[PDB]
């Protein structure tokens, strides 16, 4: 097997982890457990600490001159790696094997993530700005200090980025569909419509098929048809907020005539290449600056409560019937979008 | 480029033997290596991906393992339909690179 590592520029402080991407299952989330190695004589009288932070950060560490660092913190935990603390938090298999490797210059460290926290998410940096843009990120920091309030320094510390990510459930949910009856103010003659999907859950890039059905037993004409997929970011930071943006859509000129019936199936795909410059689009967790899929939809736990402390992101299809001379009507319906359980 | 080399260029064995083929990276690539099998005159098939995990449908008598920056493909027990030429590649840097190739008889 493999282990990731990072170290201070002075080489006296080093941290090891087994994984960079941590899965959560809404009933359990993997720990960030690992080991930290230090020169026991270098530290002299300083103490070795490791600290997890999940922050609503903005800007980037590019040394740019930006309006940097809206450094809102959602959750922080600290652990005293050295001097040797008592038995809590007994070493796992991985930590025991790491200790067998490294020797007694190493000491174990541990965390557990609270359940009610987001995945890694990043909003797309608009081209008019410079550097990175805002998005909740996890960071693990390990450093030597005389006290937890003491001043930080490069030679004193090492800093590493990690991700928290979610994958598809083991079984699918009920089929997504909806319908509507646009009857007019008093006339019995009416317009009625339907739409439905293949599944509730889709892999990224896999085509969506939307069925559409129209029952226009009325005098008005459905002039144009549109199918759009909308992305919703339920951003919360101190107030509630929301941002919504279309990520793909297809038009069809196949009008529905008065006193008529119609049905069709439209195929649509969410993909990034044609949304390259759109600001406010939520991308999945970046390590440093990599490209990646449209943000996988966050799914709420069975015990929901509020669940929102950072970015919550979801998608919905909506179909619009462009009726001429009034009567315009539309329908919307949900779906989830994420990778399958790797193996 | 990340240059790629492998040895031996050719070898031979008998039915049931345990045989080794080695591919070596010119740079410290991670576990992002894969192996392919080519019969003469035909398109390939992939045998090993990510240097350990054997591809679905392959008989488990094929195998591979990472050793630092030397990648070893060994066949647990050779059979009368294994006589083909085998290739090695890295894949976590572009352009990808393919080895010089090896043959079995």
């Amino acid at each position: 097997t493999r282990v990731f590592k990072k170290s201070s520029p002075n080489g006296k402080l080093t941290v090891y982890l087994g994984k960079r991407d941590f899965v959560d299952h809404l009933d359990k989330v993997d720990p960030v457990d690992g080991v930290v190695l230090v020169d026991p004589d270098y530290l002299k009288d300083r103490k070795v600490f490791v600290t997890l932070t999940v922050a609503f950060r903005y800007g980037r560490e590019d040394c740019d001159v930006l309006g940097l660092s809206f450094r809102k913190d959602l959750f922080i935990a600290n652990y005293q790696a050295f001097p040797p603390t008592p038995n809590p938090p007994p070493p796992t298999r991985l930590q025991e094997r790491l200790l067998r490797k490294l020797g007694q210059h190493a000491h174990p460290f541990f965390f557990t993530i609270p359940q009610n926290l987001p995945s890694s998410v990043t909003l797309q940096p608009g081209p008019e700005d410079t550097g990175k843009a805002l998005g909740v990120d996890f960071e693990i920091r390990a450093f030597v200090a005389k006290s937890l309030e003491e001043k930080s320094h490069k030679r004193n510390s090492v800093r590493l980025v990690i991700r928290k990510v979610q994958f598809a459930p083991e079984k699918p949910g009920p089929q997504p569909s909806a319908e509507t009856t646009r009857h007019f103010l008093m006339s019995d003659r009416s317009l009625h419509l339907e739409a439905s999907l293949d599944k509730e859950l889709y892999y990224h890039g896999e085509p969506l098929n939307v069925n559409v059905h129209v029952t226009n037993n009325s005098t008005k004409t459905v002039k144009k048809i549109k199918v759009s997929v909308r992305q919703y970011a339920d951003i919360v930071l101190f107030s509630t907020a929301q941002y919504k943006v279309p990520v793909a859509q297809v038009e069809q000129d196949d009008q529905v005539s008065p006193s008529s019936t119609f049905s069709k199936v439209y195929t649509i795909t969410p993909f990034l290449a044609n949304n390259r410059e759109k600001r406010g689009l939520a991308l999945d967790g970046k390590l440093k600056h990599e490209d990646t899929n449209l943000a996988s939809s966050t799914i709420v736990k069975e015990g929901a409560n509020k669940e929102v402390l950072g970015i919550l992101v979801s998608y919905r299809v909506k179909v619009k019937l462009v009726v001429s001379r009034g009567g315009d009507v539309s329908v919307e319906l949900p779906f989830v979008l994420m990778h399958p359980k790797p193996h | 480029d990340i240059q790629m080399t492998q040895s031996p260029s050719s070898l031979s064995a008998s039915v049931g033997d345990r045989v080794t083929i080695t591919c070596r990276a010119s740079q410290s690539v991670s576990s992002a290596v894969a192996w392919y099998q080519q019969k003469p005159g035909k398109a390939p098939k992939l045998l090993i991906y990510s240097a350990s995990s054997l591809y679905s449908g392959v008989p488990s008598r094929f195998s591979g393992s990472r050793s630092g920056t030397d990648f070893t493909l060994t066949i647990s027990s050779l059979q009368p339909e294994d006589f083909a030429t085998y290739y090695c590649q890295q894949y976590k840097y572009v352009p990808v690179t393919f080895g010089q190739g090896t043959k079995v008889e």
């Binding site: 097997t1 493999r2 282990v3 990731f4 590592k5 990072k6 090891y16 094997r97 790491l98 490797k101 590493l160 | 991670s30 630092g68």
Partner: peptide, 9 residues
């Protein structure tokens, strides 16, 4: 800078 090591089985 982020690197990997060994860990024998």
């Amino acid at each position: 800078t982020t690197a990997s090591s060994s860990l024998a089985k």
